[PDB]
Symmetry: D2
Subunit: 289 residues, 4 copies
Amino acid sequence: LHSPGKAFRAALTKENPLQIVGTINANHALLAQRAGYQAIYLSGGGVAAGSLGLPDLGISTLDDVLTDIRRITDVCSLPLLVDADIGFGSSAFNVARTVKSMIKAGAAGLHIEDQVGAKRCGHRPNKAIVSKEEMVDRIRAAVDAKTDPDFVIMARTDALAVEGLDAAIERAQAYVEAGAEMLFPEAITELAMYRQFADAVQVPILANITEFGATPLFTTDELRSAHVAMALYPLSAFRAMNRAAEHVYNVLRQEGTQKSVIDTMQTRNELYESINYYQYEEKLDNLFA
Amino acid sequence: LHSPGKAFRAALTKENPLQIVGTINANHALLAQRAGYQAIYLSGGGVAAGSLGLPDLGISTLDDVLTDIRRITDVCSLPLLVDADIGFGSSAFNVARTVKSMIKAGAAGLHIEDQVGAKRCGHRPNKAIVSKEEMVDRIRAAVDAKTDPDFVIMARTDALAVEGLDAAIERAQAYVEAGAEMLFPEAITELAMYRQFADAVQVPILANITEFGATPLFTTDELRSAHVAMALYPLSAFRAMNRAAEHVYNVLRQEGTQKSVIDTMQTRNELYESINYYQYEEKLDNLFA
Amino acid sequence: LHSPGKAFRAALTKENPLQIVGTINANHALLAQRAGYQAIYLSGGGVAAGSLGLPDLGISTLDDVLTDIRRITDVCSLPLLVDADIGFGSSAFNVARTVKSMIKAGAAGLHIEDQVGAKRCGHRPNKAIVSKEEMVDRIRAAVDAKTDPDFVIMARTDALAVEGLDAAIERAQAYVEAGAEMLFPEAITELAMYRQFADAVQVPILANITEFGATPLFTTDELRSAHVAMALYPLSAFRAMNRAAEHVYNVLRQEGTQKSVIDTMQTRNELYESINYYQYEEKLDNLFA
Amino acid sequence: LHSPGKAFRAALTKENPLQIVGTINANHALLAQRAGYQAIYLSGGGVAAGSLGLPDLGISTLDDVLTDIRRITDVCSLPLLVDADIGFGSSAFNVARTVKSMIKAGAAGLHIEDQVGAKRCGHRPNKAIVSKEEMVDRIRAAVDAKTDPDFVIMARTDALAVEGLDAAIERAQAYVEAGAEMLFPEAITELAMYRQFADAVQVPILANITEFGATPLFTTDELRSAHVAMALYPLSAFRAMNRAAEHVYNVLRQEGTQKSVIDTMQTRNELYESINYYQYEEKLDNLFA
Ligand SMILES: [Mg+2]
Ligand SMILES: [Mg+2]
Ligand SMILES: [Mg+2]
Ligand SMILES: [Mg+2]
C-alpha cells in the first residue's frame, strides 16, 4: 500500500528547500506536477476564497476541505500537505476526526495552528492565539489520531505578531516536544528568524512565502542559507488565475467578444495534454481489442 | 421565496443577446457578478477538467456537479445555467432525480443533450446521438420532474455534425414540442444557421461561443442579427486562468522565487473586494454592539 | 414555490399538541408519513449515534446533518425540524451558514441551544450554558440569516438543570425577545412547568418526551392541558429499531439461520408499499406508451 | 498500513461458511461487531430503500453509496463488502472510478453484476443481463482498477432467472477466468446448485440468503455441505428494524404516548455501550490529566 506521507518525507530528502506550491483544484495539481514539483498544498484560505467564494474567517467546514482533498489526490499522485487550521472543532475528538478523515481522504500531511478562532458569537475576525498549554494538547490529540505513522503532523505558530520572536520560539519548542513533526512559523519578517527556529527545534522548518504579507519574497537560495526545509507558495497560482479570469470577463463584457484575449488562453490541445487526455483511449486499447 | 429560474428568464428580457459566462468555481461566479453579468454557467467539461482534473468523457458524477452548483449558488445570487449532459443515468428516474437535485442545489436551469454516451464498457468516445423519439422521452421526463415551474429545461442537440442542418432542425422542433423551453444547437459553423433555428422553434436559442472549436468567435451584435437569445462562453476564463497559473508554476520553479510574476497577480485588496470581505465585519457591527 | 417552514407552522394549527417523531433516515420519514404524522424531526443525537455510530459529544459536523436532511426531504414532503445544536461553530458567521445551508437542504426549521460546548481540547462533557447575552446574539444571528421568512428558528434552553426554573424562564423571555419563534425547554420534570413556560413566552412550546430521561412519559392530552404546542419523540423508533436489529444479529449468529425471527420482519410487500415502489412504473406508463 | 481487503480474505480462512450480515448504517455495524461477526455488508438495495427511501431501481448514485461506506468504516474496523451493482456508469472509466473510490472510502471488497440496467429512458425496471463478453469487459476494468491488491473483486451473475443453470455456470467460469476473485450466483433455488458453482469455478462462492426471495433459508450447515464459502444476510436486520419502528410510530399515533412500546426499545445504557460511549472519556484521561 502507498503512503502519501512517506512520499512527502522522501521529497524533503531529495530537495533541499523543498518547493511546495498551492494547488487550488485538481487541474492545477496536474499542472504543478508537470511543472516539476514534488509536493503540493491545499490552502485553507484557498478553499474558502476559491472553492466557496468566502473570506478566510473560519466559515469553511472540514467537509469543504475533504472534498477538495479527494478531488486532487484522486487524480494527482504528488503528496499533498493540507491546511487544517485549528482542527475544525474545539474538542480533542474534533481534532482527531479531522486527522483521520484527512488521511483517509488521501492527504500526506497537515498543519494545525495555535489560533483561537471565534470565542464568542460576536467575536470579530482576529489573530489571537491560545496558551502554549492549550496548543500542546491540540498537537497531542492530532498526533495520537494518526492512522498512518508516516502522515505528517506539522505545527504552525502565529505567535510572532502578538507575542514577539522569543515567545514564538519558546512555543515552537514546546510544540515539537509535544509531538509536532515539522514547524511552520507564520509571517516571519526576517531571514535570520528562520535560522533561529531551525536551530531551536531540530525539525524541518517551513517558510510561508505568500505574497502581499509580512514576509519578504525570499529566494530558495536565501532560505537554504537559513536552514529552511520547505518553501511554501500557498496562493501564488490562484492570484494569477483570478486576474486572468477577471480580465477575460471584463473584455468580454466590454467588447461583446473574447477576440482580444484569445492569446491569453491555454489552448484546447494544451488542456488535453495537461489532463493526460490521451492516456485514456490508450488504456482502452490496452484493456480491450 | 426566490426562484433562480425566474431570474434567468428575466435576464433574457433585459439583455438582447444575454451574455452567459462559465464560472469554474464560486470565486469566479463572484468575479462575473462584479463584472456586471446577469447570468452564469456551470460547464460539464469544466467540472471534469477543472474540479476533477479529468477529460470530458462522462466520468464526472451528478454529485460532482451538485457540489459545484451549491458552492456557487450559496454565495452568488446570479442565475446559474447547468450542463447536465444526458441526465446522469439512462432511466427516466435518473433524469428526474438529476432535475430535482439540481433545482434544490440552487440552479436556475439546465440543458440535457441527445448524445448516446458510452453504452458499452470498452466503447470509444463519439458524437453519436439517440433517436428523435428517445430524446423526446428524455425531455418529457425532465420537464415532468420540475419542482419549480420557472426552472429552465433547455434541450441541446449535437445533430449538425452527424445528421446535417435539416435533420438538426427537425429534431429541435420535436424537442420543443416535447416541452424543451430553450434550444442549444451545438457547434454551429455559420451565423445564418442560428437564424434558421430561431425561426424554426420559436424559443430562445443559445449560441456556444467557445474557443478552439468549430464555431467562429461571433460578436454579440452578430448574434443579435441572427436572432440568438443567449451567447455562452463556457470555459473562457478557465482557459486564461490555467495559462496564468502554469506561468507562475514554471517561473517559480525556474527562478526560485515568484518576484518576476507579481505583476500578473490579483492584489490582496482586489481579492478582498471580490469576496465582499468587508461585508462580514459590517454585519457583525449591524447585528451587535 | 413550496415552503417547508410554512407547512410546519400550518401543522401546528391543525393539531393541538402537534406530534413530531424523530426519523433516523429517509425510509423512516416515509414510514412516519404513512403513519399519518404531519411533522418529523432529525435528532442530532440520532445523526451521531445512528448515522455515524458516535456518541452525542459534538463530533458530528454540519455536513453529516446536511446529508441526512437532504436524504429525508428529497423523498418525504413532511416538514422537518432539525437539531442544530449550537450552530456548528462559535461565530455568528457559522450560525448564519448553518441556517442558510439547512434551509437549502430542505429543512422546515431548526433549534439552537444555549449550551457552551467544548471550548478546550481536553474539556470534559457537561451541561454548562452560555450567558443570556451570548445566547441572545446566537439567536439574532440565526434569525438574521433566514432566507425563507417562514423557516422556523426555535430556541432550546438547558438552564433548568443548571440554573433552576425561574432562571430558565427569564432566559426564555429574553430569547423570544431576541427573535426566537418557538421554545424548547429541555428536560422538564413536571407537567406544570410547561404551563409556566407557555404563559411566560407567548410562543409555541415544545415538550421533549424522550425515554430513559428526566421527563415523565406525558400523554398528548396531558401536554395539551399544560399548553404545550408540540410533543417531540426524538429517538423512539430508533431505540426499537436497534433492539430488533440486535435480536436478528444474535439469533442469526447463534442458530446459523434467521428462520426463527422472520415473524419480526417487515414483509417485502410492506417494504414496497412503504417506499411507494409502485408509483415508479406508474409514472413510466403515464409519461410514455 | 491496514488493508480491509486482507482482513476480509483472512476472515474467510477462519470461518467456514463465513457469515456476513448487512449493516444499514454505522450504528448497526457496531452491533454486528458486538454480535460476533467477522465481516459486514453494505446492501445497494439498503442504501436505496434505507438511506434514500427509494426503490432499488438504479436511482442511487456512487456517492450515495460512498457516504455510507465512509460512515461505517470510519467507526467500525470489520471488513465491509459492498454492493456496487453494475459499476455506476457504462464506461470502463466509470467502473474504474467506482472501484478506486470505494477502496479509498474504506471498503474491503465489492461485487459487480451482469445486469443491463436501463437501456432506454422509458425502460421499465428489469432483470435483463448483458452478454458474457460484456460482463467479462466489466470485470477486466474492475480488476485493473484495483489500487490495493487485496481488495476483493467479486462477480455476481443474475443469469439463472433468464438463462437457466447451465448458462449461469458457463458465465461464472468466464467471469472468474476474466479475473473475478469470488462468485455470487444470485437467486439460487436449490442447495445442490451452489455445489455445482463451487466445483465449476474453484473460487469462494457467496450464497445470498435474503428473505422473501427465490432462495430457501439455508442453514450454515447446509451451505457448508454444499461448499459455500460465504453466507450473506443483506437486509435481515433492516427488515426487523423497520417493523419495530413502524410499530412505535403507530402506537404513538394511535395512543398519544409510547408507554405501551417502551419494552420494545433498546435502553439508553445499551445505546451508550453499543457506541463505546465510555471509551471516549477514557481516551481523554489517557491523553490528558
Ligand atoms: Mg487559516
Ligand atoms: Mg458534455
Ligand atoms: Mg445536542
Ligand atoms: Mg442491485
